[PDB]
Design a protein around this ligand. Structure first.
Ligand SMILES: NC(=O)C[C@H](NC(=O)c1c[nH]c(/C=C/C(=O)N2CCOCC2)c1-c1ccc(Cl)cc1F)c1ccc(F)c(Cl)c1
Ligand code: NA
Ligand code: NA
Length: 296
C-alpha cells in the first residue's frame, strides 16, 4: 500500500513550483528542483525548507545526486547550459556543465563519468576534467526515438543509446534492438541480464525477446534501491511530463503489483535509500505542485 504520510509545498511561494525530486545521501532530506531553476533541500517529515541554491534560469527537469553525497546532476528546460554537475562539499558550486545535453546520468558502478543525451546522440564525460570522452551515434543503427535517454549498465561496460547497445571500451555498437514504438529507448534492469525497451524485455546475452509487458507502454521507469520493485508512469504525448497514474511491478518476474491513480498530473517520483518512503510531485491545479510522501 501507499499511505500518505505527509505533504508539503514550496515554502512561502504564491505558486509552488516543485518539478523534480531525489533523496539526498543525507537521510530525512529531500532535494527538489523548481520551475524557476532552484534546488531546495527539505526536511521530509517537517515539510520545512532548510536550504536553497540557484542552479538554472529555467525549470529543472531532472536531478540525480551521487551516492557519495559529493556531487549532483541537474538538467533544465531552456537554459544554456541545459545540464550541469555540482559539487556539494564545503561550498555548492558548479564543477562542469554539459551545453546542449537535456538529460544526464552518472555511471552506476563507479560514479566517475556522466552520460548525457542530445536527441539521438550520447555523450560520455569525465567527472574529473569535464572532458567529453566519447560521442556515441551510428547512422546505420539509429532508432531515432523521440524521448531517447542514454544510460550505462550496472557494471558501466555497456551503454544503451537510442535502443543501440554499445561496448564502451571499444566505442562500438554491438547490437541494435528492433524498434516497436516511437518514443521510449529503454533501460537496463539492475540484474545486469535484461534490457527493458518500452514493452519489450530483451535478454542481454542472446538478444532474444523474453517478455512483452503492455502496461509499460510509454513509461519512464525507476527501480527501488534493492532492485525488487519497478515503478512506471506513462508520459503524456507531446506541462506535466506524466499523467495521473503510476504502476508498480515485481522486478523479478514483471508481474503487476499495483496501479496508483493520484487524480492529478505527476511531475516526478523517487524512493529513499532504504525503500521506506515514496516521494511524488503532483500538480494541485495553474502550476501549483506539492510533494507528497507515501509510506511504502
Ligand atoms: N528521477 C527519475 O529518474 C524518476 C523518473 N523521472 C523522470 O523520468 C522525469 C521526471 N521529470 C521529467 C521531465 C520533466 C520535464 O521535461 N518538464 C518538467 C518541468 O517543466 C518542463 C518540462 C522526467 C523525464 C521525462 C521524459 C524523459 Cl525521456 C526523461 C525524463 F527524465 C520517473 C520514473 C518513473 C516514474 F513513475 C516517474 Cl513518475 C518518474
Ligand atoms: Na536541524
Ligand atoms: Na527475472
Amino acid at each position: 500500500a501507499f499511505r500518505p504520510i505527509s505533504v508539503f509545498r514550496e515554502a512561502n511561494e504564491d505558486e509552488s513550483g516543485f518539478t523534480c525530486c531525489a533523496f539526498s545521501a543525507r537521510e530525512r532530506f529531500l532535494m527538489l528542483g523548481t520551475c524557476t531553476g532552484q534546488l531546495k533541500l527539505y526536511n521530509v517529515f517537517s515539510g520545512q525548507e532548510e536550504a536553497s541554491y540557484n542552479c538554472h534560469n529555467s525549470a529543472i527537469t531532472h536531478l540525480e545526486p551521487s551516492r557519495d553525497g559529493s556531487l549532483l546532476l541537474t538538467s533544465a528546460t531552456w537554459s544554456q547550459p541545459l545540464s550541469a554537475l555540482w559539487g556539494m562539499k564545503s561550498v555548492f558550486d558548479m564543477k562542469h556543465s554539459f551545453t546542449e545535453d537535456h538529460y544526464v546520468e552518472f555511471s552506476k558502478h563507479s560514479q566517475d563519468r556522466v552520460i548525457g543525451t542530445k536527441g539521438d546522440i550520447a555523450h560520455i564525460y569525465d567527472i574529473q576534467t569535464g572532458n567529453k570522452l566519447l560521442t556515441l551515434f551510428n547512422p546505420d543503427l539509429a532508432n531515432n526515438y523521440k524521448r531517447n535517454c542514454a544510460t550505462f549498465n550496472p557494471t558501466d561496460d555497456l551503454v544503451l543509446n537510442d535502443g543501440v547497445l554499445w561496448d564502451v571500451r571499444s566505442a562500438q555498437a554491438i547490437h541494435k534492438f528492433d524498434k516497436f514504438n516511437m518514443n521510449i529507448s529503454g533501460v537496463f534492469h539492475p540484474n545486469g541480464l535484461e534490457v527493458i525497451i518500452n514493452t519489450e524485455i530483451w535478454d542481454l546475452r542472446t538478444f532474444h525477446l523474453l517478455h512483452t509487458v503492455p502496461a509499460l507502454d510509454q513509461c519512464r521507469v525507476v527501480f527501488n534501491h534493492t532492485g525488487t520493485v519497478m515503478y512506471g508512469a506513462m508520459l503524456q504525448a507531446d506541462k506535466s511530463p506524466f499523467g495521473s497514474s503510476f504502476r508498480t511491478f515485481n522486478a523479478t518476474d514483471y508481474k503487476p503489483i499495483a496501479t496508483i491513480d493520484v487524480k492529478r498530473n505527476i511531475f516526478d517520483l523517487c524512493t529513499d535509500t532504504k525503500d521506506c518512503y515514496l516521494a511524488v510531485i503532483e500538480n494541485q491545479g495553474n502550476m501549483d505542485t506539492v510533494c507528497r510522501l507515501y509510506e511504502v
